[PDB]
Amino acid sequence: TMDVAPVILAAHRNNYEILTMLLKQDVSLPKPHAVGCECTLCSAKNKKDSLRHSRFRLDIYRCLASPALIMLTEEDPILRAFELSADLKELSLVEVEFRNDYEELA
Amino acid sequence: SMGQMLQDFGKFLGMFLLVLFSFTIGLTQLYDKGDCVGIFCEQQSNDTFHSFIGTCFALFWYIFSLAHVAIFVTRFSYGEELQSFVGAVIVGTYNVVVVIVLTKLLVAMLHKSFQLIANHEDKEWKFARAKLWLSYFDDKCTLPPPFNRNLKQKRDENYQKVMCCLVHRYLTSMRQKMQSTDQATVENLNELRQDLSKFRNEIRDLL
Amino acid sequence: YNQKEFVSQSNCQQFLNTVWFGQMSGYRRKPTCKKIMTVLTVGIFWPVLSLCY
Amino acid sequence: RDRIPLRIVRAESELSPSEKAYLNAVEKGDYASVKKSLEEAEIYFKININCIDPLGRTALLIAIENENLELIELLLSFNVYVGDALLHAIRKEVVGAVELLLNQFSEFTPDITPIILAAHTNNYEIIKLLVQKGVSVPRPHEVRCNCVECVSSSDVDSLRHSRSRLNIYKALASPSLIALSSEDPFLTAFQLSWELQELSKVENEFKSEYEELSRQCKQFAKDLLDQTRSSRELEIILNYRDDLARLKLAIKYRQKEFVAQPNCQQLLASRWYDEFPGWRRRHWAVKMVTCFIIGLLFPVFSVCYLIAPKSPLGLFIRKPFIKFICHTASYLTFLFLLLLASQDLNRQGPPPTIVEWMILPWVLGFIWGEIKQMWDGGLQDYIHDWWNLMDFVMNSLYLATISLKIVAFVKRESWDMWHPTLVAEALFAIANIFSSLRLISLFTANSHLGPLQISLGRMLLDILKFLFIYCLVLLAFANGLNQLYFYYEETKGLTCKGIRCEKQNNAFSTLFETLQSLFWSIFGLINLYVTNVKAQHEFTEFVGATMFGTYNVISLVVLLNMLIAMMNNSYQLIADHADIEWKFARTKLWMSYFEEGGTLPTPFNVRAADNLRRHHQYQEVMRNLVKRYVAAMIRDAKTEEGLTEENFKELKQDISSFRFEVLGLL
Amino acid sequence: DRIPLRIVRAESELSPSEKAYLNAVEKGDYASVKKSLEEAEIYFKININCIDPLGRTALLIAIENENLELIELLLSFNVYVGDALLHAIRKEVVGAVELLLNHQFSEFTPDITPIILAAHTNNYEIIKLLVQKGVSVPRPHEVRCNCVECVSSSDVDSLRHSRSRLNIYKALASPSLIALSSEDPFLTAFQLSWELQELSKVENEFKSEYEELSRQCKQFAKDLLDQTRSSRELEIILNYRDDNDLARLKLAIKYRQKEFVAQPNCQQLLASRWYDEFPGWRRRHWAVKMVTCFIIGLLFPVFSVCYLIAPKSPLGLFIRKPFIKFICHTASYLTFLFLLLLASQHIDRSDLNRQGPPPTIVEWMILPWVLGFIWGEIKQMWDGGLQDYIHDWWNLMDFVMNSLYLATISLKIVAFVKYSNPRESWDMWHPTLVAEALFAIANIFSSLRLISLFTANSHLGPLQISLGRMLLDILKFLFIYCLVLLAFANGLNQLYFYYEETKGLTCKGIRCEKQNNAFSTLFETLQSLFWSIFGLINLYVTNVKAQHEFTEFVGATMFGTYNVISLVVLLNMLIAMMNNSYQLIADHADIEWKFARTKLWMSYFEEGGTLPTPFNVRAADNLRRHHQYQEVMRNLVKRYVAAMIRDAKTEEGLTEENFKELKQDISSFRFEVLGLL
Ligand SMILES: Cn1c(=O)n(CCCO)c(=O)c2c1nc(Oc1cccc(OC(F)(F)F)c1)n2Cc1ccc(Cl)cc1
Ligand SMILES: Cn1c(=O)n(CCCO)c(=O)c2c1nc(Oc1cccc(OC(F)(F)F)c1)n2Cc1ccc(Cl)cc1
Ligand SMILES: Cn1c(=O)n(CCCO)c(=O)c2c1nc(Oc1cccc(OC(F)(F)F)c1)n2Cc1ccc(Cl)cc1
Ligand SMILES: [Ca+2]
Ligand SMILES: [Ca+2]
Ligand SMILES: [Zn+2]
Numbered sequence A: 001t002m003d004v005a006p007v008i009l010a011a012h013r014n015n016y017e018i019l020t021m022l023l024k025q026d027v028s029l030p031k032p033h034a035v036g037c038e039c040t041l042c043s044a045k046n047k048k049d050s051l052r053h054s055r056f057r058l059d060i061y062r063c064l065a066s067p068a069l070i071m072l073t074e075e076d077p078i079l080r081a082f083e084l085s086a087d088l089k090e091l092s093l094v095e096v097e098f099r100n101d102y103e104e105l106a
Numbered sequence B: 001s002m003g004q005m006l007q008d009f010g011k012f013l014g015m016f017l018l019v020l021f022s023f024t025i026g027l028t029q030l031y032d033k034g035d036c037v038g039i040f041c042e043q044q045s046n047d048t049f050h051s052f053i054g055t056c057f058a059l060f061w062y063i064f065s066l067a068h069v070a071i072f073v074t075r076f077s078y079g080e081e082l083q084s085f086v087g088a089v090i091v092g093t094y095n096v097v098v099v100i101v102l103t104k105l106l107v108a109m110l111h112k113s114f115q116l117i118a119n120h121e122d123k124e125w126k127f128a129r130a131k132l133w134l135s136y137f138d139d140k141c142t143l144p145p146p147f148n149r150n151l152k153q154k155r156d157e158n159y160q161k162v163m164c165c166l167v168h169r170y171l172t173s174m175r176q177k178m179q180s181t182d183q184a185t186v187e188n189l190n191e192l193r194q195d196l197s198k199f200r201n202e203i204r205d206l207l
Numbered sequence C: 001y002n003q004k005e006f007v008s009q010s011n012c013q014q015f016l017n018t019v020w021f022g023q024m025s026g027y028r029r030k031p032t033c034k035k036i037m038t039v040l041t042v043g044i045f046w047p048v049l050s051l052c053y
Numbered sequence D: 001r002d003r004i005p006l007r008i009v010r011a012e013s014e015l016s017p018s019e020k021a022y023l024n025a026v027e028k029g030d031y032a033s034v035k036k037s038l039e040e041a042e043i044y045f046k047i048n049i050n051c052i053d054p055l056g057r058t059a060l061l062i063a064i065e066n067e068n069l070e071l072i073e074l075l076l077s078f079n080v081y082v083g084d085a086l087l088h089a090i091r092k093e094v095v096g097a098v099e100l101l102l103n104q105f106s107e108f109t110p111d112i113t114p115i116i117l118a119a120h121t122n123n124y125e126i127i128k129l130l131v132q133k134g135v136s137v138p139r140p141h142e143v144r145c146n147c148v149e150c151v152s153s154s155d156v157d158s159l160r161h162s163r164s165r166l167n168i169y170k171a172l173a174s175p176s177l178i179a180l181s182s183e184d185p186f187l188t189a190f191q192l193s194w195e196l197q198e199l200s201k202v203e204n205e206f207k208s209e210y211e212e213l214s215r216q217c218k219q220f221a222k223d224l225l226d227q228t229r230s231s232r233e234l235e236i237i238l239n240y241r242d243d244l245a246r247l248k249l250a251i252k253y254r255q256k257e258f259v260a261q262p263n264c265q266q267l268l269a270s271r272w273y274d275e276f277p278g279w280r281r282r283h284w285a286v287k288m289v290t291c292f293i294i295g296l297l298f299p300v301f302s303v304c305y306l307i308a309p310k311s312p313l314g315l316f317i318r319k320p321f322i323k324f325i326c327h328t329a330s331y332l333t334f335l336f337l338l339l340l341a342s343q344d345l346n347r348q349g350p351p352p353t354i355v356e357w358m359i360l361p362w363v364l365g366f367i368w369g370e371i372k373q374m375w376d377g378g379l380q381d382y383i384h385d386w387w388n389l390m391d392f393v394m395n396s397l398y399l400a401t402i403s404l405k406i407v408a409f410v411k412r413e414s415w416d417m418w419h420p421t422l423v424a425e426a427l428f429a430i431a432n433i434f435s436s437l438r439l440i441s442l443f444t445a446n447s448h449l450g451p452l453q454i455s456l457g458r459m460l461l462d463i464l465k466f467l468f469i470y471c472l473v474l475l476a477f478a479n480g481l482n483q484l485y486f487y488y489e490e491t492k493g494l495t496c497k498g499i500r501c502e503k504q505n506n507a508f509s510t511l512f513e514t515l516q517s518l519f520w521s522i523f524g525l526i527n528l529y530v531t532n533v534k535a536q537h538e539f540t541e542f543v544g545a546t547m548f549g550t551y552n553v554i555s556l557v558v559l560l561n562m563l564i565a566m567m568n569n570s571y572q573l574i575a576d577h578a579d580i581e582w583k584f585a586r587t588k589l590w591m592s593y594f595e596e597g598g599t600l601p602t603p604f605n606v607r608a609a610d611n612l613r614r615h616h617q618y619q620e621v622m623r624n625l626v627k628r629y630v631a632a633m634i635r636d637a638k639t640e641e642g643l644t645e646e647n648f649k650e651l652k653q654d655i656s657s658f659r660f661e662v663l664g665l666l
Numbered sequence E: 001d002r003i004p005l006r007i008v009r010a011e012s013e014l015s016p017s018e019k020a021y022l023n024a025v026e027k028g029d030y031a032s033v034k035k036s037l038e039e040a041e042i043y044f045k046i047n048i049n050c051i052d053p054l055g056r057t058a059l060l061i062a063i064e065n066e067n068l069e070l071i072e073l074l075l076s077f078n079v080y081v082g083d084a085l086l087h088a089i090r091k092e093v094v095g096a097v098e099l100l101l102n103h104q105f106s107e108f109t110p111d112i113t114p115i116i117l118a119a120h121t122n123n124y125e126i127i128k129l130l131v132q133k134g135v136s137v138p139r140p141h142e143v144r145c146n147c148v149e150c151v152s153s154s155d156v157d158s159l160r161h162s163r164s165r166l167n168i169y170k171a172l173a174s175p176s177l178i179a180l181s182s183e184d185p186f187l188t189a190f191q192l193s194w195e196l197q198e199l200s201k202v203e204n205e206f207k208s209e210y211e212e213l214s215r216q217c218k219q220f221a222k223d224l225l226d227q228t229r230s231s232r233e234l235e236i237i238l239n240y241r242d243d244n245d246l247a248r249l250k251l252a253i254k255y256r257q258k259e260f261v262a263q264p265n266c267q268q269l270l271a272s273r274w275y276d277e278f279p280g281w282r283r284r285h286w287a288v289k290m291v292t293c294f295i296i297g298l299l300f301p302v303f304s305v306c307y308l309i310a311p312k313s314p315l316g317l318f319i320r321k322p323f324i325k326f327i328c329h330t331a332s333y334l335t336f337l338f339l340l341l342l343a344s345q346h347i348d349r350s351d352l353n354r355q356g357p358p359p360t361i362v363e364w365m366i367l368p369w370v371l372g373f374i375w376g377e378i379k380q381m382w383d384g385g386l387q388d389y390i391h392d393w394w395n396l397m398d399f400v401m402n403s404l405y406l407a408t409i410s411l412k413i414v415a416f417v418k419y420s421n422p423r424e425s426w427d428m429w430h431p432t433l434v435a436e437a438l439f440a441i442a443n444i445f446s447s448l449r450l451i452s453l454f455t456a457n458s459h460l461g462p463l464q465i466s467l468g469r470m471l472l473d474i475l476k477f478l479f480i481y482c483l484v485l486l487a488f489a490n491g492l493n494q495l496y497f498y499y500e501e502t503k504g505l506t507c508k509g510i511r512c513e514k515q516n517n518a519f520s521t522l523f524e525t526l527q528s529l530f531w532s533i534f535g536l537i538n539l540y541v542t543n544v545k546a547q548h549e550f551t552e553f554v555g556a557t558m559f560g561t562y563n564v565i566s567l568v569v570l571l572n573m574l575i576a577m578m579n580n581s582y583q584l585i586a587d588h589a590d591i592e593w594k595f596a597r598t599k600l601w602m603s604y605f606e607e608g609g610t611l612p613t614p615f616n617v618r619a620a621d622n623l624r625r626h627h628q629y630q631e632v633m634r635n636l637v638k639r640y641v642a643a644m645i646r647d648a649k650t651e652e653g654l655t656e657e658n659f660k661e662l663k664q665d666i667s668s669f670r671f672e673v674l675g676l677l
């Protein structure tokens, strides 16, 4: 898909070597918005392309939920896993259309 | 498991309230015109269906099918045959759509549900037991009802050492399990055919 | 954070057992009859223990 | 003898030792020895080029299962007997069949042409090559065809004709042939799924194969919906028509896999909550408060769009969620009117204006709504939904109540039991029961109670199938009790006859009372003394008691628990995938409320260039879709696959051929 | 904004020469790794002990990728060996002999020695090589011991001690070690399965691993019996004793080895012993089986007196057949039940006698049989111990029934000797009435023993066994029911007991023609709420004779709420739980029935108790048996390890490691060819 960066796909295939060479190149993913963020951008992207925005959010939260990216770039992987599981459960509560995927990532 | 199971019952009683509400409306519309008063006495009589809350009371006790409400409550005191027979048919249809249909549907739903919880049963029980244990681990209230900074940096450094060790061990264990669990697919066969053909072509080119 | 798998792990549950049982870590080593009568004999004189604390 | 002698009764063909060495060297993938063997086979030798094993393994066929391109080229070079080896190359799923394309018993059916086997194997490159060579499949007849020639062919060989039709329909239902040869693969998938369903209905045998084919076609349509990646592409596909016309077609053809797509449900939820964002994000109490204040203020929005349609309050009814909220607020208002109608002493009733006069038109609006539903769909669409049948009997009872009240108007404890007032009141009560049971169909909109209602609705058929057997048992035992107990029909001194008395008597005197008593015996509401006659004949009393006992055993212990077990299995099979059924029903509700017709609730309802542009847009986007789909199934088929014995045979034979080539070189 | 990704765990990525070294190591080129080592002798950036942040070394990769010449080359060049031997044993590679004789984030527990990991991997050759070299396993302590070492290790490091105990028990319970080093692998398997069961019961943590280990030991014993191929081997296995006996079979029954006993060969031997001297009893028509069972049942006393007179007689030896002995015992019990059934009906006397004299009709014939039962239960209490008596619920019910019969006899002789008048004038606690009621309860306990007689039948023995399995889960749920019943009963009593009335009524309580004072006391409230499950309590018990409508409504609401619970929630939960329980135990019903039937068979196999219930009242031989058992069991162990290795070559499994193995092998061959040619 056109919204997928190499580091997001690298986190999708969950390989530690590809991660440990890719993050050496100073790579940062976009920050996903909140559970109910309806700002000037978030209310406009849903108007623009709802499916593209939903797939971008799912790809980002699949990239962050990989164990390799948690264990490489965070101060506390246990705390990041806890917060990410809680956030993913809340998103699966909110996002009715992709309950199985967000529940699986949690 | 029963505490997890109660939501199925919540949904089933949500449907049963609407079914009960329909018949209660039908019976108290049919029997409205026609000592002990009501249903809670020896001679149950026709006064069960006179009031709306009395009709809900009478149709509440029919679900057990154990002679809680005798069928002479459906007989008119004025002796009208057709209204009494239609009331009997209505209460029979209630005893069919419940007891015979809804209760056994509930039994099937609970059978599938208890098949579903039972695999994640020990983990849930241990989690609830640990919740109670950590509720009782505090020094906040030890009596029964009737009686009722560089150190942070050192702790963070110790935690970083322990977590670095844990990350190393989990990475090694994850790659060990990954290499010992996945099955070979046809694409790996295709790479092996490629290596064989590349051998054969290099042999032909060299010789 | 409602982590069911984190707390059901054998190591975490074992640590919780050692914290929970307190001084008498051999209570698990006791037979079931001895555990029963120990629970009973603490259940009788509980106001004495509360008052002495 | 104490030993069983063993021999080959069907000895079949036998091979020369030189022929066996030739075949074994072909199996080893040898260049030099096989080439030399065919060279001596050119001159007059024992070695025959067209050597066939009794296993049906010709050197041609062995090399096809050997996949060695050089060996198969060598064998076609000296013109071996080419029989069905093309079909063997098709089955093996090897691209080397183009070499045979460029160039006794049969393991395949005589009907099987290369395209049918290519579609069965579902390889994109092979089917592409076969259709590039130029190939037309045979035409299957219609699902209810009438051909004299096909009837005569069925009379000659019914088995071969049925196998031929099954093979043709299996070739057409292949996803690769649909994606490669059809103008509109979504329309082709829909029509083929419907044809396969009706074929499984007509052909009771071979029903599992046709059901598998139909499910495969539905899975193909769902995958082709999966490959989309833009809301623009969804709006091109679902709104295509030759308005969500394609979604209407999916609704009509019962494509629950297509309809319950997460992207399609995303579009449907966007269209249902028209300009209503953050409804799921807001609190449950907050959104129920908003629903309650929209439904409480229902007359002001419904009076609008009737006088001022272009007003913002008039355009508030345009949103389908507001339309559904207004409709259900109207229905709970109707049930509130019925409740107050439930809560004088005249032969004919004057019309009770206080609460029972505004029901008359609302029933008339209900009748007008059902007539409008009758116009939109014909007779099969109305009888297809059981809820339309329930609405039909509800309106029939209400019309009969009105007619009986009118008949009473133009014409207690004193009237005949067939007075139109009493029958009108009873019919009104049963119509009230049906009208209040109508509320359970609104649970499809809710997420918690939706799958519950749908699972109950499609297990009602199994319930009825059990109740037929219960009806037979009930009739048998009632006939027996009638024959036994009808000589003791009491006639004198009874203040109350039948089972519906304070003292039960005459329970089994007639057939109708016996049916009622045996029905009520399930719930334990018939006491044991109804089997005691006034006479002294204790043997007939005991036979009646044991007959009642055996019935009670059969109904309560045996048949009821059998119903429990059958319900267990049925609910397992239904709640395996009931979520797609629930989403299909919710989409049916939403799209029934998407129409511009019926915007008013039952209270107040009483070019070629554009077609070419749409066709080209749909075509381009679906070239993109089929490209993504074939890339996806090529990627999927390359992984999570077992190698099994054939891949090991190929991989070992390559090393064997390489070793023999190296030994020839060195 | 954007989430920054800074690598927190800093690992050195090493020199490019080290990466070329590692690439030559997995890539399989023998020439490049040798040239790299020769270059590394000058001590530039490449090091022989380079450790890759994934956690692999050149030696470790050479271990993971076989090619024993590569490990030989690296071991000749002084590569550090910290745990490469342990990774060789974990990899199940037989080339660990090179690390054996030639030359903390360790990815292993510090407890784990080579022999522990060897037994964990269950590789016969590696364990054989390690024991041949000379290696030993630390001895675990008792399951329940309060010794100083165990508690000291628990206070120092509880997790390390528990993991060490688990690893030791996982090493001892391996089939290969047991088959190689244990002198008596059958007894070792039995004792280890029992000890692991006690460890699972005591240590609630790590319970799944312990029950899996016990299941593995039972699997090992079953497979070892499945490797027999002769009757004499089975006879010398089952009759072997530590110091027709079937001592090993008794000990296996004691240790609850279900699938051991339910093996087809053991069943065949036990069925051959069960139908002793029978020319094909099973090869019979079922009608002929029924009539012949009837005629052995009828002639029970003549066989009994034939054994009492002449033990050497053919009829006196007819009872020694265990099937005929079982038939005669069932005939005695059925005659006892028929005597009680006649005692209910033959009695036609005044039934008014003050003391109830013991008649000659049924009494003095029930009395001996009762004391024969008492003597038999005393004998089974003495023989087999008290624990075996209380293990079976059937013996507990038999003891209760015998105690009730003794109480009835004592009360009857008390009424004979004291208080010896119309029947309605008797007190409610008269000794004769208490004797009557205790005889009735003993009779309903005695007539249920025929269910224990039903394990022998093939068609319904598994059914009775499955009901016996899920009766425990029934009691498990009845505890929750008891809590609900106590809650609602004492609530309803606290409501209605202010409205207690008598009014001189003929009957009080629920068991009257008209129910009254149902929720009066706690006993009556518990009785009334119990009977409401079965609908025998009418709805007119909830209203009071006064006109307090609110208390009547809330009492009816509490009664209806309890009825809703115990008739919709708890009963249907019980149905679903029973459904899942019978689904779980349907697969294990056959082996459970076979184990129970063999216990019932071997109850009658002993010499004692031959008389029925009417008449209940050396070193050279040991060395020869030891040598026969040793040679037969050595043959069994050899057959089992051959079959286990063959199954290891049979299981349909190919990981991604072996594709990488073939890829590395063919690449190494190619690079050797290109170096040569
Ligand atoms: C709803 N209903 C009812 O109300 N009455 C009471 C009428 C006055 O007492 C009835 O007698 C009555 C009844 N349905 C009845 O047949 C059933 C058929 C199938 C299933 C079923 O359900 C269940 F399996 F039993 F659970 C019931 N019968 C028996 C009957 C009566 C007359 C005739 Cl012609 C034919 C059959
Ligand atoms: C059909 N039947 C019956 O009608 N009566 C009433 C007769 C007049 O009251 C009975 O008493 C009666 C009866 N079947 C009976 O035994 C059953 C055996 C097995 C199953 C069963 O089914 C269920 F499990 F219970 F569901 C019932 N018994 C009890 C009985 C009575 C006398 C004698 Cl000698 C032997 C047995
Ligand atoms: C607890 N309870 C109760 O105690 N009584 C007896 C009170 C004195 O008679 C009732 O009549 C009574 C009752 N719950 C009732 O509704 C139910 C709710 C939930 C479950 C249920 O049952 C089942 F689980 F689905 F099977 C039934 N009703 C019926 C009712 C009566 C009046 C009114 Cl306004 C509304 C409902
Ligand atoms: Ca409709
Ligand atoms: Ca006993
Ligand atoms: Zn935003």
Ligand SMILES: [Zn+2]
Residues within 6 Å of the ligand: D141, D142, D145, D146, D147, D150, D151
């Ligand atoms: Zn035709």
Ligand SMILES: [Zn+2]
Residues within 6 Å of the ligand: E141, E142, E145, E146, E147, E149, E150, E151
């Ligand atoms: Zn110790």
